[PDB]
């Protein structure tokens, strides 16, 4: 995904 990856 082009979005910012959130918390793992």
């Amino acid at each position: 995904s082009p979005g910012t990856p959130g918390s793992r």
Partner: antibody, heavy 113, light 113 residues
Framework: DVQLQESGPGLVKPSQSLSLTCSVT?????????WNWIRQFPGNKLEWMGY???????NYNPSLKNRISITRDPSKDQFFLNLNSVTTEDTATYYC??????WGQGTLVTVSA | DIVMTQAAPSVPVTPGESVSISCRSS???????????LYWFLQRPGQSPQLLIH???NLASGVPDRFSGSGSGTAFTLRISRVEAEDVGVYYC?????????FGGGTRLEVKR
């Protein structure tokens, strides 16, 4: 709450290196997100410089890739901007961010002899 | 690089009324996952930019719901309903589809009195 703060010198001489620190409070930089440097020139134009990811992987704006370095110290929840061989064109307000949502207050850096 | 264009340098608006701010991209920001990767920011005078809208139409956390986003492909609109004094500043769009992330030149909102 998660907060970011830029620190570093306000005046750097041309040909030398600009070194800024983003200190992150109340969040572990290994936990997720991209951690960006974004600068705003006099006249207000914004430029995305690059990021370091939660795993330490970098991604740089191609226009800066030869001069820029973004690193981190996970143990201190700090990440760093190093911009080599600065010119007057690098005069800007520098922001660190967590993704697009959380912004530091910005720090002005003037490049001049 | 994707070129982002905001045609209007500024827009005047009577308090309590609504206003639309336009943005355009040189390439479609639509992704196969269904999202369109266009973000909106407000920078109030003396302040850091703040996220208003992510992925074209999604309201960001902690943002008043008078801000909304719409668009299609290469054309985008930020709508601000019931404009208030705190809404003065410069509104920037930013594409988030491809690296490097790129910003429009900004549209200043002026309160008409």
């Amino acid at each position: 709450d998660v907060q970011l703060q830029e620190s570093g010198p306000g005046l750097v001489k041309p040909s030398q290196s600009l070194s800024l620190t983003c200190s992150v409070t109340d969040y572990s930089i290994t936990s997720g997100y991209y951690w960006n440097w974004i600068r705003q020139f006099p006249g207000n134009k914004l430029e995305w410089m690059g990021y370091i990811s939660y795993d330490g992987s970098n991604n740089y704006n191609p226009s800066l890739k030869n001069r820029i370095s973004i690193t981190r110290d996970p143990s201190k929840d700090q990440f760093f901007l190093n911009l080599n061989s600065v010119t007057t064109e690098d005069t800007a307000t520098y922001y660190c961010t967590r993704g697009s949502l959380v912004w530091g207050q910005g720090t002005l850096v003037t490049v001049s002899a | 690089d994707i070129v982002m264009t905001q045609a209007a340098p500024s827009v005047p608006v009577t308090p309590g009324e609504s206003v639309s701010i336009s943005c355009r991209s040189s390439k479609s920001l639509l992704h196969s996952n269904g999202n369109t990767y266009l973000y909106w920011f407000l920078q109030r005078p003396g302040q850091s930019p703040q996220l208003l809208i992510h992925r074209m139409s999604n309201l960001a956390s902690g943002v008043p719901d008078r801000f909304s986003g719409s668009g299609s492909g290469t054309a985008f609109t930020l709508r601000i309903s019931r404009v208030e004094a705190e809404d003065v500043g410069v509104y920037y769009c930013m594409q988030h589809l491809e690296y490097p992330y790129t910003f429009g030149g900004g549209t200043r909102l002026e309160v008409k009195r």
